[PDB]
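Q: For a teaching session next week I want to show students how multiple molecules come together into a single three-dimensional assembly. I've collected the sequence lines for a complex. Could you give me the predicted structure tokens for the whole thing so I can convert them for display?
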Amino acid sequence: LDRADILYNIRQTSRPDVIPTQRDRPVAVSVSLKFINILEVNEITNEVDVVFWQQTTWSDRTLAWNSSHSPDQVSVPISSLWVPDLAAYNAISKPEVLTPQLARVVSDGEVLYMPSIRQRFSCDVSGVDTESGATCRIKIGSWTHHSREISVDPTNSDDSEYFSQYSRFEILDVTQKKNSVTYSCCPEAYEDVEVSLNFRKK
Amino acid sequence: LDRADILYNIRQTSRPDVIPTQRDRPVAVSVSLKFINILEVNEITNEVDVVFWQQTTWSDRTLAWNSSHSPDQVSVPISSLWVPDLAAYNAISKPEVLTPQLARVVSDGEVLYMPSIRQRFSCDVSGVDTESGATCRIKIGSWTHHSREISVDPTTSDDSEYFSQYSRFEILDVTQKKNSVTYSCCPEAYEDVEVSLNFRKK
Amino acid sequence: LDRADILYNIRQTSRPDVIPTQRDRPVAVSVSLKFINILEVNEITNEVDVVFWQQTTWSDRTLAWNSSHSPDQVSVPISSLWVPDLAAYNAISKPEVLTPQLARVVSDGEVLYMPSIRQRFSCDVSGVDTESGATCRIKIGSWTHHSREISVDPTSDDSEYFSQYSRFEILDVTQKKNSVTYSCCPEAYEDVEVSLNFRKKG
Amino acid sequence: LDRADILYNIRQTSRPDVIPTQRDRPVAVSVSLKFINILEVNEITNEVDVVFWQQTTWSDRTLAWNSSHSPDQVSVPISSLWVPDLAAYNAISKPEVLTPQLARVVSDGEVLYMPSIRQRFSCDVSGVDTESGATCRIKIGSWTHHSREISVDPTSDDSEYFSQYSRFEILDVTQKKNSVTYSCCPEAYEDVEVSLNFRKKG
Amino acid sequence: LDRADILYNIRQTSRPDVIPTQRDRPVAVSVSLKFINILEVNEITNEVDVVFWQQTTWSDRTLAWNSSHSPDQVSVPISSLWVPDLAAYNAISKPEVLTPQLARVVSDGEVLYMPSIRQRFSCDVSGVDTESGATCRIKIGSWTHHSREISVDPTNSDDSEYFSQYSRFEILDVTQKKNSVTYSCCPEAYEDVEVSLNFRKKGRSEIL
Ligand SMILES: CC(=O)OCC[N+](C)(C)C
Ligand SMILES: CC(=O)OCC[N+](C)(C)C
Ligand SMILES: CC(=O)OCC[N+](C)(C)C
Ligand SMILES: CC(=O)OCC[N+](C)(C)C
Ligand SMILES: CC(=O)OCC[N+](C)(C)C
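A: Of course. Below is the structure for the complete assembly, covering every listed component.
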């Protein structure tokens, strides 16, 4: 098997509209944000503009192949793959993807999609100019799939590992927590990850 | 019947250009806005920038399947479905959809489409800085289908249920009213929902 | 014949690239603007930001069907139809279509496409803050079809749909037809000239 | 041959990717700018915002038809045609096409594509507020085709279509042809240099 | 073979989704930036707005043809070609491509893709108003391909050769360096080119 064959097969038979549930267990989706930059902060309106690297991981066994004498991995356009419908509940602008939209697929079926994203958020910006800093919370969850179809789980490296040293801001701490919430509109629980960003103006 | 089959059938046969009228009764569309955030208000120009959750519900029996030993629901890209052509009569910017464009389809034919939307509106903003607050009205209706083809109806959860606690504004009250209007441009009646948002600066 | 059949036939055969001329007479296209809002006015740069409903009407007999025991009308995506290539000669931004892109087709072949449009124009804004107001002229014509292929012709109240929350008010609207030859092309080109007399509200 | 047949044939034998060279002579492309408006000028940053009408003309003999008892001309979507890859070397924003994207094709093979374009340019703006005015130069050439494949050649009162409501007035427009060798490639690339002499009005 | 045939063949069979590796050696991609303009500089926020030509070059032997009595080269829409997934690590806006999206393909398989791009970057802008100027660094690498699949390499030239004389800024120097980096996220190494742009505001060089 070579890369041409593997990509042909994926394109011909991958089902980007079909959630790859196994045994009607939920698809486990790992999510972790690495912050790259904080661009604009407005303490009056409580809005922040952020660039982040959104690492997303899940299994789709329908993508698997025998890698004995073959590539162990390929890069695939996400339009050819099922991708989880993650949304940030407190976003106030659409996500602007800055990077090429390619996922990495491993022969066992694991998929890694790590786009870089610029997006505005509404959150608590008070204290950004103090020693304690502000604590901004971002909630990311599946938009239409409940906990029995998709479960999200937080995953690492330094919080500033990839954070720009030229930002006006600095990261004090990042914590990631998981939630399961029921909403009035729907019978089922929905999972989300809540990322807490503690940051301040230098 | 598995998801893959259900989604294959819907893609092969749903017809997204055809309004699913039964027995030439109008398609009943339920609409209700849940406000998430009020971002920019300009009392001088009478313009408001709003984020809201537009819950939309209707029946398309052509999507139905026998759910014995089958999923009761699937998520479907809205490009594969008929979707009502709702428009806000007093919008002054195009709707910016913030979330993944997926509708949820139930085996009986019920469709639930609930996008999160950012949009600018022209409305009465006077009094936003008083105790009584301002009352902004948004009219949403089918753009090209008259009352014999589509009827819109509001549906009744608390008003601030999903409203951001970090907005500069707070919601005092939300009411939803139904209208049937004839215009000079056309002979038939057009139904709309009028949502009244009473809000003020905190 | 039901909606599904009518829409299937139109999709299969309608020819969106072909101007529906009959007997080599020009296609008669009716155009009338209904102003909805005036958003930004700059008396210094002579630029105005307008929202308007663009009523456009013409006949395409190739879309006709026998409406005995059939719907008299359907809504059709404009990508399935021939649509006139109208352009505003004094626009300085591309038209932002705010509404669903659907035309209404009658069984006799009449088409009604009426999008809502936000667009910036360069015109005479002087006097906007006086009793007489400013008079802004917008010229709309076929971009590439001359008077033997397409003729445009203007076709109730002025402030009928004009927002009561605008900073501006409409004093008068007149619609005039022109036939112009340019230095570049030997042929003549029809346009409608819409004159908007408006001023700042007290 | 009616218009439907001509357009069917063009669409079916669409090679919009193939430059229509004959006998390995270069395709001769005529270009001339008609300025419509100058919107924003910044003497500090040396940036100008311009609206102009780009008249472009060339032969594609593969589009020809016998026009005996047939239309002499048709309008064709440019996605069905080969179009020259012209770029403005000193542009600092992407071209915003304001008008319908249709070319006019004559039965002999001549093509006429004249879009209206809003674009920002970096050029010499100094002296814009003097009697002599500023002289801004725009260079337009084929981006990837050298002089043996495409030749560009320049070809009416300078302000014939210039808006009388601009803050600026045109003193003079000259068009010059160039043939340049770059460090990147051994071959010469042709361009037209348009010189716009303009000043702030009084 | 004429142009029509060559373009038909490339369209029908070229697999824009398949990296053209030979012998499982990495695809060698050459990258060099030619700066055209620096538009907005903010010393407070450390952001710069740049226009540049991204010259990109690589071999795809699956595009080759026998050029006896045939064109030696064609222009091809990049949607019909494999193109390297380069990204600027310190970009803060998406690249705005200003030019037609066409690559030039030579009969031997060599591809040259040279788009003009406007993009905002986060980098060190301090000293932009001094004689020494600022030194802004831009790192460009393959986003998802590691060093065994894609290697990037910088291409002596004139730095200001295409730089606008009407910019508020002037280029003092440009250097291009190659890196190979391992990240905590992933076991393999990723190559990038680091381009160092030394520039300053005009006016900051007087002797009189
Ligand atoms: C169909 C749909 O949008 O369900 C919404 C679930 N929630 C509340 C997580 C967004
Ligand atoms: C075809 C069409 O746009 O009809 C308009 C109906 N209305 C007034 C609800 C928008
Ligand atoms: C092909 C073409 O654009 O002709 C232009 C006609 N005019 C002057 C009405 C725009
Ligand atoms: C392939 C390519 O972009 O060649 C560039 C020619 N030039 C310098 C006219 C833009
Ligand atoms: C799949 C993927 O995005 O890998 C990331 C490699 N890196 C760190 C160069 C961006």
